Symmetry: D2
Subunit: 329 residues, 4 copies
């Protein structure tokens, strides 16, 4: 039978005999994602260009998509009464939910990942990671400073040619396609597993002058295979959500290592690296900084950055072995 | 004064004192693009997954997006009664329109550009080029073998985070955003001009082992600028329509040179190279094979391939100079 | 804060400490209603008229809206795993849900009320009534033969100028507007109460020659008020769902008494009369046959018909008093 | 061969060898109707209920549907550069188009017909009538005071279960169904003709005490046929556009005669009576005040009211005969 995300989450909540708080949280997230998707596809843009004249608005209201997306996630999540602490890629400080709407979950999210791709209409998305508050003390940012291994759920919504929500939980990864005609996420790929080895590598090679020797050696190997096999194809959309999703469904490797401007990597641990690392591991893939598992890093800053290498097991392992080789010399 | 694509096309037609065929042709194209966009965004996918049970469908009908898009363009274009010859990236032979629906225009198109990106939901699109039938004899594939310089109109529809139709004609390039709420393309960027020089290079570096010396030297300059300026950023979505659109709005350079498997490049002259070269030149950019202007190539086969380098004039000119350097002596 | 139907039902299910079966049932109903609404608004009709040619369909598939709506409700309800017996206005026999998807709820529904108004595009809708199975015996039609007073939930979806779902439960009536942009039902009217007295009467006067003396006297009073007040306005859309909804929000009276062709009334007790009678009483209105409360009738036939008079308390009471007056002579 | 309203309008324009103003005018009307339809179906209502919090709106902007619809028609029509005078049911004075956007057509319209039905979600619509400016002097309200017989085009958009645009011109009436998925009006019924005799009568019988003897006798015949034939069914949605549309597709009669408060009828001649009378006559129906043809009335005020009886020729003729009967002697 057909399974909607709403039914899927409701059923999962009944299997774990939960209070239904996670269910309400996920339902709220779904609503936020649909609202963001409709805005991203520019529904109603004609009004902004004066189709009905200029009488409605009486001042400023041309809210950018990134700001709107952040507002939607924050407002819809608070209204779920299932959260206590929120960490957004767009906010310098953690948001502490009011007692009246306070729940037990901590949510770290990137409302509209792929800032540089917004104006050129390339794929963008929303990334999220959910933790259970493990403290009796008053909620604070410390509750969001948990290693990714502690995630109870993570995933992303990709606003690409079509909108898809990928949800990973303890039991596995599932993909739901948004049917905009009825505003329903339809389960189309169950218990997804990434290919053991891919044929695509994804990295911004513009930083080549600053890559460490391991990354450098690896890329050279993708272009000039020592076994004389066909070189890997290259793909770099520029939005983490898009490149990671392709990595999941096609296999291969995604990399954002450290460079001069970003000595500890560019991508953020809480709402970029951990969520994707969790999705990858639940799908049978790997996620490493090149020296340690991303999910095992205990953060000390909600906006902490980290180098990341993720994707097909055999591909990530080959790169890890290069790092280990250099360290053994 | 909001301007819809319908109004824009209608006006341009009344100024050129044209009969009205081009206007009808463009109106038809717009209709086809909206139908493709809705299908690409997966509207109604719930029905394919049995939301209403299995009673309506009595056999096969799970038509893939590329085939559906091709069917939409061919059917909608024929219904315009403004075309006589159609060349599709999906069909081996040129399509000759029946006398009953025969018009004076020749249309070369790529129904759903970015085949490899369809399944991973990355941006895809539709590319088109329109020619006026020159000869007076019976229409045939030869009517589609005109140099791009002869184009009367060209452009593309990008099904990205939002859907946009970019239309280039004799007087310039205009960008229309599709407002899915009312099925109207809204003029949002008029007489667009590409920046003289960008800071992004776009190419599949997986073919590095097979690049000619000029491409190789150029890429080395983007990563290790000889004058110690800032290295360029890299972006390669993998769908020509998406990479070219970003090149248009952000500036920079897009390249798909020849390699071992594709000795004369991979991209097709009639419905990929020429349309984009026309958009670029009308926007103040350049489009070359590295040795000659794309628009001046005399096509000898409807599915002829050609190497292509396009984008900001200063970036393309620099690469042209390198080719000259490696051609001297 | 904003409240979606999904959150509303989820919260209600948590307050009654239910197993979550009713919640899954209502969520499924919402999905079905959205699917019916999109079909009713004719989304995708262009495909039926050959926009993409004729290659997809390979036979018959032009399913009428009433049949499609029935298929959607049946399939989506069965998939909720919350029902055991279904009674449809379109099916001669009660549907007994398979053991594997069997739940404890009985649902009586009118998939697309207002058959005569379908082709002229006048408002139509879906009516539903939900009962708890009160028997340990194998599920059968007998489980649907309960008086309306036993309903646990009832309501309707109106596909009018906009789509609205009206849900009545033990605690009251709430109205949710469907926002088609995001596929979400938004709570817009809470704990709705009908006006004590209205100024509109709704009945098909074409049957005047067959009305009983009470109905006849009442209508004459609406046109020629004995107190010389302004006569009531008349409205009869022809679809019960539309006329009843207006009665609820504007007040007044709706009537479908017995006539020659329909000696026991035309409207069906299980999926037309009871659901609307329940909504009315929960909103402070009344629903009578003219001699007894609709909700107190113990049915003996799943397709049993009944005369019905419903709406504002003072209006229905005035008509009841006429019936009582005649019976006292 | 699917036919869109855009193509139909374009073709009709190229056949009449018209300049293109009417085509531009109709294209603009279509755009306005789609924008009104989307607003009527409540797309985006979630934003009004705080789904994204309260940060975007900085004041009043909760524009009611009737005002918004009026703004859409006026603005979109002006942008067509094809009109010089506009008369709206919502505005006391005629609107004179600025010389810069001044065209040759005069448009009389009812932006959102069915005011009383807006809040209860019953069908509503937009009615329009188009005239060609006759005189050569400065445009004024007088240019809108032409008898309906002078109309060059008229029709309406019905926002019912689905949205449909009915367009009547010199050669006939055509019905286009709006496919909201692609924002295209699809021709579904060509050269429509009303049945010679129907079996439905439509009138607000609440004014029975004030009806003239002819209307009274006629209604008595519909309920108690003198020849003992089957009584007619009654239907009165309450929105002229909806009742008239049903009359067109199902046949029968629609009436709004004079009463005490409305001695010359309630419906307005310029944008309600004339447009519908034109549609009716082009469909083989009739439209009379009971004493004269509606289309032959010489308007003396832009908001002049007139009694109207329209529909199937045999039904209207019967009522005309009754009026003659009560006029003899
Ligand atoms: O431009 P570069 O340095 O490649 O960085 C792109 C990466 O950073 C991110 C961070 O969100 O994009 P962006 O800064 O444009 O928002 C990721 O989406 C993406 O993977
Ligand atoms: O996979 P590579 O060799 O980079 O080729 C991608 C290029 O070819 C095209 C040809 O259409 O993609 P694809 O073959 O996947 O359809 C272009 O869209 C794109 O620019
Ligand atoms: O045509 P009449 O006899 O007025 O009956 C209309 C009534 O019957 C119903 C029954 O569903 O319509 P219909 O038979 O056209 O489906 C109700 O919707 C409506 O109230
Ligand atoms: O309420 P009554 O007097 O029946 O008037 C309804 C008639 O008037 C109109 C005038 O537009 O409705 P309304 O005043 O509610 O806008 C017509 O749509 C309709 O036919
Ligand atoms: Mg990001
Ligand atoms: Mg950022
Ligand atoms: Mg292509
Ligand atoms: Mg191909
Ligand atoms: Mg019914
Ligand atoms: Mg029926
Ligand atoms: Mg009106
Ligand atoms: Mg009014």
């Amino acid at each position: 039978n057909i399974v909607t995300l709403t039914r899927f989450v409701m059923e999962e909540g009944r299997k774990a005999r939960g209070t239904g708080e996670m269910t309400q949280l996920l339902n709220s997230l779904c609503t936020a994602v649909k609202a963001i998707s409709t805005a991203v596809r520019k529904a109603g843009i004609a009004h902004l260009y004066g189709i009905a004249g200029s009488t409605n608005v009486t001042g400023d209201q041309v809210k950018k998509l990134d700001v709107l997306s952040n507002d939607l996630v924050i407002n819809v999540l608070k209204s779920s009464f299932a959260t206590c602490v929120l960490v957004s890629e767009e906010d310098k400080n953690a948001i502490i939910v009011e007692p009246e709407k306070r729940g037990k979950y901590v949510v770290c999210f990137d409302p509209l990942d792929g800032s540089s791709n917004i104006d050129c209409l390339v794929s963008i998305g929303t990334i999220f990671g959910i933790y259970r508050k493990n403290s009796t003390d008053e909620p604070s940012e410390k509750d969001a400073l948990q290693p990714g291994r502690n995630l109870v759920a993570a995933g992303y919504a990709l606003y690409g040619s079509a909108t898809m929500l990928v949800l990973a939980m303890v039991n596995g990864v599932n993909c739901f396609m948004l049917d905009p005609a009825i505003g329903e996420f339809i389960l189309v790929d169950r218990d997804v597993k990434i290919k053991k080895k891919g044929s695509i590598y994804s990295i911004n090679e513009g930083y080549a002058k600053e890559f460490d020797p391991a990354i450098t050696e690896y890329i050279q190997r993708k272009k000039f295979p020592p076994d004389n096999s066909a070189p890997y194809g290259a793909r770099y959309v520029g939005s983490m959500v898009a490149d990671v999703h392709r990595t999941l469904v096609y296999g291969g490797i995604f990399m954002y290592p450290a460079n001069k401007k970003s000595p500890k990597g560019k991508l953020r641990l809480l709402y970029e690296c951990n969520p994707m690392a969790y999705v990858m591991e639940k799908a049978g893939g790997l996620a490493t900084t090149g020296k340690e598992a991303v999910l095992d890093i205990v953060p000390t800053d909600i906006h902490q950055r980290a180098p990341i290498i993720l994707g097909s097991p055999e591909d990530v392992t080959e790169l890890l072995e290069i790092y280990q080789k250099h360290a053994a010399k």
